[PDB]
């Protein structure tokens, strides 16, 4: 109900965020190949199992 609500501030954060370009990385396989690598990453190559199975653990 604020008739004086400042509309001039729209887009502030998206305007002032530092523009960081996406890194160039090799393409990930698509389809059955992606299901293959997902299966290996989840059931064969079980890397991080701290406490229980962890699937997107950070550094340290």
């Amino acid at each position: 109900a604020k008739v004086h609500g400042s509309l001039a501030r729209a887009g502030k954060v998206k305007s002032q965020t530092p523009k960081v370009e996406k890194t160039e990385k090799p393409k990930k396989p698509k389809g059955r190949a992606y299901k293959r690598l997902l299966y290996t990453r989840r059931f064969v190559n079980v890397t991080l199992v701290n406490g229980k199975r962890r699937m997107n653990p950070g550094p340290s």
Binding site: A1, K2, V3, G5, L7, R9, A10, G11, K14
Partner: protein, 144 residues
């Protein structure tokens, strides 16, 4: 017992009682009264086009503090005036005044969403271009 008739020949009473008490449901009442056709900003439609009348800054409801950047628009097909929320960071600079927008609901079949008070619609497109495409920079707003 049970306060309702049970005899084999009481079907008329049971059917009429169910018909009468059916009017206490929300959806049945709306369907039978045709409220969407009669009293609804859209004519029962999912989307509607409008002409932006002005840009509004709506204060957020407690316990949130924000300006929600809505637009007051007038619908083409019936001339009703509604308020539509413009969803994203920015995207209010894409709307402008006197422009043509397309509106959908929020998803609560009426029932203003979240901390925005009394706003039941959101802008999908402006000047024939998707607002998501304008925000992702896939497209550009036409001059016309």
């Amino acid at each position: 017992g049970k306060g309702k008739p049970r005899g084999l020949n009481s079907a008329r009473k049971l059917r009429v009682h169910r018909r009468n008490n059916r009017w206490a449901e929300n959806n049945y009442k709306k369907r039978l009264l045709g409220t969407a056709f009669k009293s609804s900003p859209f004519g029962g439609s999912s989307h509607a086009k409008g002409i932006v009348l002005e840009k509004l800054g709506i204060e957020s409801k407690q316990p949130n503090s924000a300006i929600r950047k809505c637009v007051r628009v007038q619908l083409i097909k019936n001339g009703k005036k509604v308020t539509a929320f413009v969803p994203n960071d920015g995207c209010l600079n894409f709307v402008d005044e006197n422009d043509e927008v397309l509106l959908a609901g929020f998803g609560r079949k009426g029932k203003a969403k979240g901390d925005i008070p009394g706003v039941r619609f959101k802008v999908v497109k402006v000047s024939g271009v998707s607002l998501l495409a304008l925000w992702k920079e896939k497209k550009e707003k036409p001059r016309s």
